[PDB]
Amino acid sequence: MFLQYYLNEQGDRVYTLKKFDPMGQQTCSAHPARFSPDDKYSRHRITIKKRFKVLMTQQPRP
Amino acid sequence: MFLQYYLNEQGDRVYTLKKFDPMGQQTCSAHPARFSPDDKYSRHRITIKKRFKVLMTQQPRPVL
Amino acid sequence: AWNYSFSQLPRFLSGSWSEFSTQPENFLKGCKWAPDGSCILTNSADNILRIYNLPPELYHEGEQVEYAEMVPVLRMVEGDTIYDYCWYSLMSSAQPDTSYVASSSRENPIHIWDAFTGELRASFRAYNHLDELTAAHSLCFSPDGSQLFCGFNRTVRVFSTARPGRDCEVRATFAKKQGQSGIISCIAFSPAQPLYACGSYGRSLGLYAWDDGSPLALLGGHQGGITHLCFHPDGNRFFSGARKDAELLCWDLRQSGYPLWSLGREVTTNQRIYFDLDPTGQFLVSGSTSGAVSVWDTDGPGNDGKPEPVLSFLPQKDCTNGVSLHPSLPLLATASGQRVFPEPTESGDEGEELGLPLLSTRHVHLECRLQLWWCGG
Amino acid sequence: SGERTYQELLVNQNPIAQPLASRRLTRKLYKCIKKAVKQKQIRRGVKEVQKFVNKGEKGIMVLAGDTLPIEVYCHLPVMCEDRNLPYVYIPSKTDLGAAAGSKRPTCVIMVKPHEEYQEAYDECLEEVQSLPLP
Amino acid sequence: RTYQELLVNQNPIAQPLASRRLTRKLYKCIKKAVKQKQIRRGVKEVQKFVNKGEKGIMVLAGDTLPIEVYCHLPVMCEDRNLPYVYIPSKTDLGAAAGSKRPTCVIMVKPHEEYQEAYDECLEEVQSLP
Amino acid sequence: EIQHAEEFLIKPESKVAKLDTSQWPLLLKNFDKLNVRTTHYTPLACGSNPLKREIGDYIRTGFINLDKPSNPSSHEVVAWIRRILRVEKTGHSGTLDPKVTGCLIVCIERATRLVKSQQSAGKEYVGIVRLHNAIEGGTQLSRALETLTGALFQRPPLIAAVKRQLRVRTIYESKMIEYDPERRLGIFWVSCEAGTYIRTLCVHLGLLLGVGGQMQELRRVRSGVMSEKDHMVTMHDVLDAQWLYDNHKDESYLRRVVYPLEKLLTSHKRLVMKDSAVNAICYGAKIMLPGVLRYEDGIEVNQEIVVITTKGEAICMAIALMTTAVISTCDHGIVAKIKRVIMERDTYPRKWGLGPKASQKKLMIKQGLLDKHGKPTDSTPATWKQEYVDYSE
Amino acid sequence: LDTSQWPLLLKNFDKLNVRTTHYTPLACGSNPLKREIGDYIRTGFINLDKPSNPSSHEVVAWIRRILRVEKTGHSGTLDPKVTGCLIVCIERATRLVKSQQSAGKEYVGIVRLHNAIEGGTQLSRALETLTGALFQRPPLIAAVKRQLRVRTIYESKMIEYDPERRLGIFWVSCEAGTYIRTLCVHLGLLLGVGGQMQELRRVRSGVMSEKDHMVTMHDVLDAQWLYDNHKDESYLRRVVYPLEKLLTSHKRLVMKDSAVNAICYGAKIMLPGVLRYEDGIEVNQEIVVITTKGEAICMAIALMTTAVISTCDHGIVAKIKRVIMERDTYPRKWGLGPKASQKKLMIKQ
Amino acid sequence: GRGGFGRGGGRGGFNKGQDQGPPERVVLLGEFLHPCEDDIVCKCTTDENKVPYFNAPVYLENKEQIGKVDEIFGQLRDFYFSVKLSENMKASSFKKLQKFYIDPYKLLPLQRFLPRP
Amino acid sequence: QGPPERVVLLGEFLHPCEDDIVCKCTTDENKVPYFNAPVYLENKEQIGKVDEIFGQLRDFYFSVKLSENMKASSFKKLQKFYIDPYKLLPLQRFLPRP
RNA sequence: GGGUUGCGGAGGGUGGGCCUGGGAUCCCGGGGACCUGCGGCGGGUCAGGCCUUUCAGGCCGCAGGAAGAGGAACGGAGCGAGUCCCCGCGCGCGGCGCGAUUCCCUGAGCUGUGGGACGUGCACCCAGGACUCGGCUCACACAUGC
């Protein structure tokens, strides 16, 4: 996959083909990660997200 | 009881296990003294507190 | 064949002083031998169960014995303060299973460690009525080797050795009209008849039955509280030692309700002074608090009887807490220990004046070592 | 070392700790207490102190400077004032308890002269009767 | 300047980082060990072998999005009582691994006598705040 | 200044009363800008707001915006969501290819009523076009891209089933962002209606360029009214929500990912109605004048409207027939017709029998003057017969 | 003075949506702060610190004997050997104690272990594992009634841990009914070493905590002595606080003065009686109605929504649940309405 | 039911030669623009309403089958289509301004393609 | 007095705890054990009963009391523990009150 | 849901109304109710079997109704007894704390910011939810105006 994108100043998605931003940021992938149906690792994810305060629960609702 | 605490900067209670604060303060007990119903020594308490101005009335007013 | 007799002064052969120095203050107490006599248990102020090994008897056969430091083969850890400790009754090197030691901490339940491996094998817990754990003070094994006795506030509980759980037989002592005392100091067994004596801390002594569990006699105490109690193996005799008392008493089962004879000791502070008794009944070694280990003689001709002192010797200037002798081979181990109360003397004036006293309490030396004495023939 | 220790003790005090003593005053008081404890003439405990003040016993009261909360010893100074008795405050708890002859902190202590060791006790009384009161 | 740029392009959840020389020592150790016996580089195989149990050191990447890719590995190492590291580099780690596409997870297992430098990194990770 | 025990009393100022309805929830926003008709009705207790709704109805009723992985298909992720949420029905907004990512609207039980209209909605697509030969400059590619604008023909690829027939799809906007000559790739953004194919578009672009090509990948940016900028959630969060609900009993993480179905019908005109008519319309009826409470200014004839309740629940979607200037003057008649029901049949107290005219007509039937099936009976009052045959009979 | 610095039930009264402002101000009335001592003591709550020596059963008796009242009640039945906050009400304040008892309370206790632990990480994991809904049983032995209880726990984290003394303190935040002794027992069984609870200290009890006027019973005794020997009520007002402060997070509903007596005698809140309301009032919500001065009349259950009462003209909006005011408080004016009274007299004539 | 010009038979009308051989009628179809990967894409100049059929053989002025219409694209106004070349042919041979012809009855009116409600 | 019958898998050995066996519940997929319920082994032998129970809703552990003439060092491995099926209780009625 | 035909050589594609029945632009005769939600009606390989499934369009079978939509008091509050779920003395009450009057401890068993023992007494044992029945006071209630 060669689809990269970086967050805009306003907050929109700007798709690009390069891997480096002219401002000095490293672009990430635009496609989501592989999801497995037999994924029994949902408790560790929630714990490590609660330890660092990164869940969507603490995020407000626009 | 080995349950001490020290006042924090913001103004909350921070319970600790040691008897000495790392800043250089002496920690105190977290539990109050035992109360006695038949206590006739309440007249001198208000006198002591007025002599040193440590009454709830001599302190600022509650914000509510 | 080594004849056991007191003719000369005890001889120093080996010692151990490299340990018990890492802590600011440390005190040694206990130092009893094993029934077979191949291990030594030493308890310090810091809770560490040290099992010292026995020096080789072939090394003791000759007089060329050189000084050596006995390294502990086992070093166990304990959280809270220890109350009592004893070896198993039928302790032998032949049987590998009957080679465990018992210990009772302050808030932790009665723990049992193994001499061979060094790890906790079993543990007996005892709860009181609501939900909490009660502390045990007395610790001694039964001669048959199937039951375990422990002391408590006002009752005695009997534990087994095959079902390590909560099941235990309770035997209350205090009642509405009767009652012995408060906290029970220790419990010692007699090998002549099935009965044991219960020594408490409140000037009280009593003997109970083995299986029936019924009081027979009830006596008092010197002035304070009994600390240690043994039994004379030759017959119906047994001694008892209390704390903060300068007198000793020997109670006999052939007398009805009064002390037959009285002896003199030296106890200043509330320490746990031990006194060992020879299995042949010819010598009675006992340590004092003023730093003087005295020995007595027990005569049994038939008509005259009086404990007479043979000799006396001071190992160090400290307080000899534990004194015990080896069962077969001539040997005697002693340990010292004494607390130091904070004495905030005016050091500023001492450093300013430099005059009359020229003394400071900061340089006082206190070291608890473990010596081994030799007995000749 | 003495000045820094005194400052550290001043830091950890009680709100009601205005009547105090000097360095030599505290040393003399400690020496008097250490000379009087060996004669068994000292009382340690608010219970017996107030029990005998209700009846009446003349002496010198020695309270601690660092003891929380405040409601523990709050009626003792007024009782001593009504009974016309002076009281002493020192910014220490461990040293006051060690001077009694133990390894535990003690706050309340009453002294009673029985033997001829009062030649230094009267000086301490006259000195505590002259310290500036708040 | 370089380490600052690597810290700018970092993942949110990565506390246990390394210093400027500890990462060089770890890179040297990994480059020495990749030729001696073996190094495991794959999420599936790492988790499959951790399910049964294998002692080692987990080498995760500092720049790998999204976070849901590697999100249950460190908690699994904590449950199995195993330490892990974090490095703000993926290209250098991928080049040191097999001179190929940038890898994310790397496991090391000592077989030869090269553990004299491995226990030092182990105790350094155990001392990491 | 700490004022304690001060005389505080609300001063009775006889001023005009104003209300600010700009911060109220989704369907209650600007509820005071609707022209008032009648404020004499008896509100019923059976009802609530979509925002503060029970979790049982929050999971049952509502949509979700998912970011589909590129590994599985759309039906497979739909079935996975149905198995994770433990529901019976589940639907999607568009059948995406396995190797096509982007947003996807998914309803579950009661929001699947209007999926037929959601499927036929304009969607945006972003993919990479691969070439075979080389192009001279990017200006020629931009010209070829702007040439393929408007309505054009499209042939179904061999992949799905077979070439069936020729379709006519319309494209609104298409512009290229970048183009790399070294790798012979390039990203582009196309915004068209549903049914348009991107692989066929790439094939046509390659045929126009004279080098050929296909569609490498594809990414959806906007699908209808919801895009990647409006709380785009993934499947891992949906899977973690069920675990956090069955292990920690926390419904916040489930209400954050699931959104009420009333959000879709936001750009449509709302029509407030009485609580006595909601059940009659759910069973099925026509919208009358006495039931209408408020209407939106700027309503034309034959316009897609939505019927809402005073609390804010979407009853159903109707087709308005009268104008605001006509509904302000007219007294009786039909204004809307039932098109697609969204609520249940038994949700409000069932009452449509009693009334000012219905009871009178029923009593006249019971007497014997008028008949139930026969309209032209005696009918002594002519003004009654001339004011009852104006709706449908 | 601004509208955001006013007393307890008076902050931001302008933000309340206005519907009508034509009412007659009556003479009778008072503010909660400037209330008579007789009513200031009989109405209100007290957040005192319970000594660790007695139990709460004796503490409530001592406080009702000192305050010389007839009725009193506590917020939570605490053990004898535990310290923490405790809310005690009076005869005119124990009406809403049933809802105050069922509230989330935080706990802080120390756990004593038996064997040795390797590090703090494993015990931290064991503490994080016991989070959420679990099974618990009474520490003592009970009958078939108390066999299994199901409680939930929100947060649990440990501060420190001493390996030399084998202790460690922790903070747990859960709801009422959860036990701490069983929690430490389960923690010790999970660590494989066993253990129990050494002590316990409550930091939060419902809405009140140790940072909001932590008074002591000694202060209550000093106030009772000063109010009788010196006739000083300031030190008595500083310890006692009105009961209208507990219902601060609940929505407010301003009513007319003529409807106060109707609600007191027992009636239904109508549309003309409501003066203002609060945005965000859903169906079947625990609402409390107040007067124009700020005195809480009673607690009600609102039926209609803000979007419904903003349009409606007549109907029932709230239902009487529990009265808090007295009966004889406002004049008797029921049948004097503009149209309703006219219709009633018309049907009467 | 089905029927007409076949479906189980064969007939003929105005144009004949699609499957028989020599054609009779021919109509201009497209104009050569440029080759496309061994295929020829053309633009319809003047049929005035019509689009070609699937796999429709294309002829030149001399009525010689060069290939067949493979794909069709473009807008409604500007329409294009591709031609699949046959064997033993060269795409570089036809590189001039010439017209391409097709059979007249291989078209379809766009009036039916227009959406009618 | 009950003879041995069909037995169902109960738990998995985790670690001992003060002469008690602390086990982790296996896949019975909704079941919780009864108090003082006899636990059996693969050879249909009465090992002990079920002691106090703890744990969360999904993953919950349980401790087992030993019988007479039993040793805790015997099954110091990862083996399965079986329980009678008549000592079960549905939890579907615990969380929902209606 | 069923049926017919024409256009392009050959199992594949597209398209067709309110008009008909009889007599000489006209007349006569007829077509016997609607809304809503769900399920199916298509493709591929060799007279039949297998798999998946809805873009374009109506048909069939089932579940409810004859829908012009009323309400300015059906409707409340303070108490007493019984049982269940609830309360740490588990239905055995004295192993509970504070005080005048006595004693002991730096105990190494908690322990003087208290504990150990004897004698003399006062206080300590109370609350939530559901259901049946008995029983009093108030009122029967849309909330103006100056």
Author numbering:
A (entry chain F): 1 to 62
B (entry chain J): 1 to 64
C (entry chain B): 145 to 521
D (entry chain I): 19 to 152
E (entry chain E): 22 to 150
F (entry chain C): 29 to 421
G (entry chain G): 47 to 395
H (entry chain D): 45 to 161
Quoted from the paper:
In most eukaryotes, telomeric DNAs are synthesized by telomerase, a multi-subunit ribonucleoprotein (RNP) complex with a reverse transcriptase activity using its own RNA component as the template. Human telomerase holoenzyme consists of the telomerase reverse transcriptase (TERT) catalytic subunit, the telomerase RNA (hTR) component, two sets of H/ACA proteins (dyskerin, GAR1, NHP2 and NOP10), and telomerase Cajal body protein 1 (TCAB1).7–10 Telomerase is activated in continually dividing cells, such as human stem cells and germ cells, to counteract telomere loss during replication. Here, we present the cryo-EM structure of human telomerase holoenzyme with bound telomeric DNA at resolutions of 3.54 Å and 3.94 Å for the catalytic core and the biogenesis module, respectively. The 451-nucleotide (nt) hTR RNA is composed of three structural domains, the template-pseudoknot (t-PK) and three-way junction (TWJ) domains in the catalytic core and the H/ACA domain in the biogenesis module.
The 3′ H/ACA unit has an extra protein component TCAB1 that binds the CAB box at the terminal loop of the RNA hairpin. Interestingly, the 5′ tail of hTR, previously predicted to potentially form a G-quadruplex, folds into a short stem and is stabilized by an arginine-rich motif of GAR1 in the 5′ H/ACA unit. Consequently, the two H/ACA units are arranged in a tandem manner with a ~55° rotational symmetry. The ACA box (A446–C447–A448) at the 3′ terminus of hTR snugly nests in a deep cleft in the PUA domain of the 3′ dyskerin similar to the contacts observed in archaeal H/ACA RNP structures. Strikingly, nucleotides A372–G373–A374, corresponding to the 5′ nucleotides in the H box consensus sequence ANANNA, are recognized by the 5′ dyskerin exactly in the same manner as the ACA box by the 3′ dyskerin. Hence, instead of being a guide RNA, nucleotides C431–C436 in hTR 3′ hairpin function as a pseudo-substrate and block the pseudouridylation pocket of dyskerin.
